[PDB]
Design a protein around this ligand. Structure first.
Ligand SMILES: [Cl-]
Ligand SMILES: [Cl-]
Length: 188
């Protein structure tokens, strides 16, 4: 789907009262556009954290509020978190490495790190190790929405659910997701 389609869907969600949304972007031009539109939480996602950092600069210059950068190591997370205007990181890691990553980020004074993993099982391991914010995603979204609701009922807070169309976004909201991530490769 195109960026205009994603903007329309995000505005529709907001008009329904669904305000706890995060917009994912994959280029600096899109980051500027989403920020200029006034969306309050933007995920900048590039293959390399350096590309995300350049997108964060474009979003900040266009007025962004909260900017989350993707990373796959603790070192990359620290580089992003130290960048002006960046307010959080989405760290793709494994349960094996999460203890060390958590300790490293904490010692540096950073807490706003969202963990994601390759399987819902590994994400549950990350929560056990002390991950306080997680992102759940699945091929069909329905699996992710169900897992988030189960964890929420087990007392887990700050679950972000990735969604690929507006029906899934609404279901994730209704199930109590802390935030809903709108992924651009979806059907909007
Ligand atoms: Cl605009
Ligand atoms: Cl918003």
């Amino acid at each position: 789907s195109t960026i205009e389609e994603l903007i329309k869907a995000a505005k529709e969600l907001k008009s329904l009262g669904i305000e706890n949304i995060i917009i994912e972007v994959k280029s600096a031009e899109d980051a500027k556009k989403i920020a200029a539109e006034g969306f309050e939480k933007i995920l900048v996602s590039g293959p390399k954290t350096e590309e995300g950092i350049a997108m964060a600069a474009a979003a900040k210059a266009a007025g962004a509020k909260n900017i989350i950068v993707t990373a796959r190591t603790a070192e990359e997370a620290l580089a992003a978190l130290a960048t002006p205007g960046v307010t959080g990181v989405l760290l793709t890691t494994t349960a094996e490495e999460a203890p060390a990553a958590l300790a490293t980020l904490k010692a540096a004074g950073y807490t706003n790190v969202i963990f994601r993993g390759p399987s819902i099982e590994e994400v549950k391991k990350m929560i056990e190790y002390g991950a306080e914010k997680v992102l759940i995603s699945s091929k069909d979204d329905e699996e992710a929405i169900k897992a988030a609701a189960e964890l929420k009922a087990k007392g887990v807070k700050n679950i972000i659910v990735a969604t690929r169309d507006i029906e899934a976004a609404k279901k994730a909201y209704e199930a109590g997701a802390s935030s809903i991530l709108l992924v651009p490769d979806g059907s909007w």
